[PDB]
Amino acid sequence: EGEEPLGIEAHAFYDKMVADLRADTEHVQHVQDFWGDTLTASGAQSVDG
Amino acid sequence: LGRIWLPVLIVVAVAAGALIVMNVRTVFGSNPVVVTEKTSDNAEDFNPKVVTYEIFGSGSSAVINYMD
Numbered sequence: 001e002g003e004e005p006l007g008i009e010a011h012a013f014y015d016k017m018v019a020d021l022r023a024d025t026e027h028v029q030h031v032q033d034f035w036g037d038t039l040t041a042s043g044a045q046s047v048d049g
Numbered sequence: 050l051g052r053i054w055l056p057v058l059i060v061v062a063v064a065a066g067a068l069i070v071m072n073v074r075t076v077f078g079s080n081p082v083v084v085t086e087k088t089s090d091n092a093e094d095f096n097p098k099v100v101t102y103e104i105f106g107s108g109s110s111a112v113i114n115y116m117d
Contacts, residue, residue, distance in 0.1 A: 011095065038096050045091035 005049035
């Protein structure tokens, strides 16, 4: 969640977090990334953005 | 409780009737309009695909028609 609509820096932070989550094989098994892919990014983000 | 049993029971009955009234009277109605839920998508421009048209030749000028 952000006070302002999420932009490029938010996407970079999200990508880094997703990579580190996928790194932890012991606890995390699968991350379905919809916001990263432009085909499904509309669903993963709120109307206000 | 020869002189206490009657007023207490009267008050109890009145309270029960008042409670039933207050409930059932308010149950009626309470549905004048129907409002549908809204589920829109995020309208943003991140990683938009870019299409480039190029025309070139030995001629000077050209007439070009394309679909946006």
